[PDB]
Amino acid sequence: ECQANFISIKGPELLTMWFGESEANVREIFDKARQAAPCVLFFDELDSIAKARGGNIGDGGGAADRVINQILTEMDGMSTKKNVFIIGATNRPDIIDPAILRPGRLDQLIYIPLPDEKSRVAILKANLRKSPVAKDVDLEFLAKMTNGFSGADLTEICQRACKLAIRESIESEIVPEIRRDHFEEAMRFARRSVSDNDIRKYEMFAQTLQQSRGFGSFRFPS
Amino acid sequence: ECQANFISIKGPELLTMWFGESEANVREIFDKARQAAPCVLFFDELDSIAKARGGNIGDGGGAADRVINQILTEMDGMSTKKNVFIIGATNRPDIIDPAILRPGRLDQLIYIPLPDEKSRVAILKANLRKSPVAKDVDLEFLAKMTNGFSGADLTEICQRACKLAIRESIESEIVPEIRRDHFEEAMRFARRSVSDNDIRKYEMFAQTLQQSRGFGSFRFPS
Amino acid sequence: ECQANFISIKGPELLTMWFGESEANVREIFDKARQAAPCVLFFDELDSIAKARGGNIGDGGGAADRVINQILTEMDGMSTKKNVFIIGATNRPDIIDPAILRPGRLDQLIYIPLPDEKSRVAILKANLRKSPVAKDVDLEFLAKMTNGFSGADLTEICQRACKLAIRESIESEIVPEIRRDHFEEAMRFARRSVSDNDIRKYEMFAQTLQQSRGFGSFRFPS
Numbered sequence: 155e156c157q158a159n160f161i162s163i164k165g166p167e168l169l170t171m172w173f174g175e176s177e178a179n180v181r182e183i184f185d186k187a188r189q190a191a192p193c194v195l196f197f198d199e200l201d202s203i204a205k206a207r208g209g210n211i212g213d214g215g216g217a218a219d220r221v222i223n224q225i226l227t228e229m230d231g232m233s234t235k236k237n238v239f240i241i242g243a244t245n246r247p248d249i250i251d252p253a254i255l256r257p258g259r260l261d262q263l264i265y266i267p268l269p270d271e272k273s274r275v276a277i278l279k280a281n282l283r284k285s286p287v288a289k290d291v292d293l294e295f296l297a298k299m300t301n302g303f304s305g306a307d308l309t310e311i312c313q314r315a316c317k318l319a320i321r322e323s324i325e326s327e328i329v330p331e332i333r334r335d336h337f338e339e340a341m342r343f344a345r346r347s348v349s350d351n352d353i354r355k356y357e358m359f360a361q362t363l364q365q366s367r368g369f370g371s372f373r374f375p376s
Numbered sequence: 377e378c379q380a381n382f383i384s385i386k387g388p389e390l391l392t393m394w395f396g397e398s399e400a401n402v403r404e405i406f407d408k409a410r411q412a413a414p415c416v417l418f419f420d421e422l423d424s425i426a427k428a429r430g431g432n433i434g435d436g437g438g439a440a441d442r443v444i445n446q447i448l449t450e451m452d453g454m455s456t457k458k459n460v461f462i463i464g465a466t467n468r469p470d471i472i473d474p475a476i477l478r479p480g481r482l483d484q485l486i487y488i489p490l491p492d493e494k495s496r497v498a499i500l501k502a503n504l505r506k507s508p509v510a511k512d513v514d515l516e517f518l519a520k521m522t523n524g525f526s527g528a529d530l531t532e533i534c535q536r537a538c539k540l541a542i543r544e545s546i547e548s549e550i551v552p553e554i555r556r557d558h559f560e561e562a563m564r565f566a567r568r569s570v571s572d573n574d575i576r577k578y579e580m581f582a583q584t585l586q587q588s589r590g591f592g593s594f595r596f597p598s
Numbered sequence: 599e600c601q602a603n604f605i606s607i608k609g610p611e612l613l614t615m616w617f618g619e620s621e622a623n624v625r626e627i628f629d630k631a632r633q634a635a636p637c638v639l640f641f642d643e644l645d646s647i648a649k650a651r652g653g654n655i656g657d658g659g660g661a662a663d664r665v666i667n668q669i670l671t672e673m674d675g676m677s678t679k680k681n682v683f684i685i686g687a688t689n690r691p692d693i694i695d696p697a698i699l700r701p702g703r704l705d706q707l708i709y710i711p712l713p714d715e716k717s718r719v720a721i722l723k724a725n726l727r728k729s730p731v732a733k734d735v736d737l738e739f740l741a742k743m744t745n746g747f748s749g750a751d752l753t754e755i756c757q758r759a760c761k762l763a764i765r766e767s768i769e770s771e772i773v774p775e776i777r778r779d780h781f782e783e784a785m786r787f788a789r790r791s792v793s794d795n796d797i798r799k800y801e802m803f804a805q806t807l808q809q810s811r812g813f814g815s816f817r818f819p820s
């Protein structure tokens with residue numbers, strides 16, 4: 155949307171320098187993120203170091219480590235007039251170090267929920283955009299049926315339907331179109347990896363920081 | 377079946393680089409696994425590092441270490457169009473790090489049960505394929521008798537029968553054929569190393585990830 | 599179905615004699631259950647005493663108490679030729695004392711799952727059998743939409759729709775028919791009291807006692 159460059163740093167690249175005690179690697183990451191103006195810096199599974207160290211308690215130490223410290227130092231020294239942007243992604247925000255969320259570094263926190271009915275059709279069609287889809291196979295109804303399903307759950311449904319279609323095509327040689335029955339049968343092994351307790355614990359975090367109470371009704375004098 | 381090359385990495389080779397802090401060894405493993413296209417990469421007792429560190433809890437840290445991190449990094453960077461394939465083997469999947477089982481790396485999990493009656497005959501005949509077997513020695517009945525027996529249990533039964541036959545042949549000098557009595561007597565010291573609690577705990581893991589409930593009966597409108 | 603009498607003993611009646619140290623009350627319960635031949639004896643929330651004492655561990659004692667002991671004594675002394683029948687109901691079977699499940703008393707254990715699509719229509723129509731239901735209000739679709747919903751979840755949906763209809767009827771005086779909009783709007787506050795972890799923990803109990811392994815394929819000689 156911003157016509158900006160994109161740099162992705164997954165968990166293994168972040169945890170490699172933690173184990174290796176070689177911490178000059180973030181230097182070039184932030185250097186090449188700023189020369190490609192405008193760019194966007196994306197940190198995947200930022201909680202990887204916290205999980206590797208234990209998480210909320212772990213050892214006698216807190217939630218502060220060296221790699222996140224280097225990221226904090228590099229982010230503090232950046233120029234606001236540049237168009238470089240840092241995006242952090244995590245699934246466990248309770249073990250994220252509080253100092254990275256301080257105002258001025260990552261003060262903006264937004265919650266990514268489960269895909270809704272409108273967004274699930276997009277996940278199904280993204281998976282099936284390379285496959286022969288029959289006319290009778292209605293993705294709107296399939297997305298309506300699954301409600302608490304994650305993108306991964308729909309992904310494995312599509313993969314299992316494709317596997318069934320491929321197997322039927324192979325065994326039928328001794329049809330080049332995914333049929334309604336393939337999706338109907340593969341719908342039986344429908345998992346739901348995200349539990350309700352997880353949604354509750356993410357919400358407790360969400361309106362932990364919402365706090366829209368107290369000053370809800372204000373009237374100015376004149 | 378695929379006419380592909382095979383590379384086996386046992387537990388000691390994986391745990392040697394963990395203790396030695398020398399982690400360039402996975403680099404050449406994955407390099408020589410990909411140049412021999414088509415190949416299959418097999419990791420034996422992947423939980424060796426987790427057992428050496430403690431397992432489910434162990435120290436204050438979680439289930440993430442450096443060697444599994446290197447394997448994750450190498451697997452993430454591979455090309456899907458190549459025919460290289462990675463197979464992980466473990467006996468304790470509860471202590472396996474969750475990140476290696478993420479979709480895209482080792483999402484496919486299949487359970488290897490105890491050999492059934494048809495498969496136990498194969499284990500017996502594989503062990504006895506180099507030994508003189510008498511006609512009256514019926515392996516079908518022997519495999520039928522042992523039910524909750526592992527391949528190792530049948531292996532030691534065959535080894536003990538061979539030991540008894542060799543000892544009788546040596547002492548009789550002062551017959552070059554394994555007799556029915558050798559197997560009948562060696563059948564007395566029949567162990568069963570796998571307990572029922574183990575089977576129960578493996579199943580709890582199995583339909584932990586099965587979840588074939590909820591969407592079992594679906595009817596399309598038209 | 600058996601044209602038999604029915605006696606229901608809820609949790610409070612069972613826990614009253616536990617606190618009151620007055621344990622002759624089960625005597626008349628079992629006496630009047632057997633004189634009304636044929637009858638059926640139903641014990642609701644049998645785990646109430648275990649919950650009141652702590653459950654799996656609780657105090658230094660085990661899972662045995664006095665009231666369940668009296669029920670065991672009364673059940674052991676009954677005549678099998680009589681048509682009296684005892685049914686125990688519980689939601690936590692992990693804290694149920696093992697001795698009540700011994701063969702001869704309550705050896706038969708069956709699992710009551712969440713209602714399926716066919717059974718959910720019955721729950722909706724049982725709740726709405728006394729209310730004016732509009733023609734366009736399709737209960738089949740409503741039951742299809744809710745999948746992991748308990749009978750209580752559908753019950754509160756129906757109650758909330760009735761409350762909305764009653765409120766609109768009262769405020770409109772200053773219509774005597776539940777409309778499609780009443781159910782559509784009340785569908786927004788749809789709870790799901792039973793979590794997936796609960797279903798998993800009930801299943802672990804279920805094929806704890808299933809054990810259909812080992813002797814799955816048997817062939818007789820002749």
Ligand SMILES: Cc1cc2c(C(N)=O)cccc2n1-c1nc2c(c(NCc3ccccc3)n1)COCC2
Pocket residue numbers: 269273274276277280281304305306307309
């Ligand atoms: C293959 C695919 C897998 C996947 C997964 C997953 N855990 O497998 C999760 C989220 C999106 C996913 N996609 C996906 N991939 C794409 C698109 C798309 N739809 C938009 C969207 C994005 C985030 C959210 C909702 C819906 N979804 C759209 O076009 C590009 C590719």
Ligand SMILES: Cc1cc2c(C(N)=O)cccc2n1-c1nc2c(c(NCc3ccccc3)n1)COCC2
Pocket residue numbers: 491495496498499502503526527528529531
């Ligand atoms: C000596 C031998 C020991 C052993 C053991 C063991 N813990 O001792 C476990 C599993 C298979 C084993 N084998 C074995 N070895 C072989 C074969 C064979 N049968 C097929 C099979 C494979 C896996 C499973 C079932 C049955 N079994 C077949 O031909 C090659 C050698």
Ligand SMILES: Cc1cc2c(C(N)=O)cccc2n1-c1nc2c(c(NCc3ccccc3)n1)COCC2
Pocket residue numbers: 713717718720721724725748749750751753
């Ligand atoms: C008001 C009512 C509430 C309720 C609840 C609840 N937690 O509110 C749970 C289960 C059944 C319930 N019913 C109910 N009540 C009735 C019926 C019926 N349908 C059959 C049925 C039974 C058990 C199971 C499924 C479906 N369901 C049938 O006619 C008699 C009354």
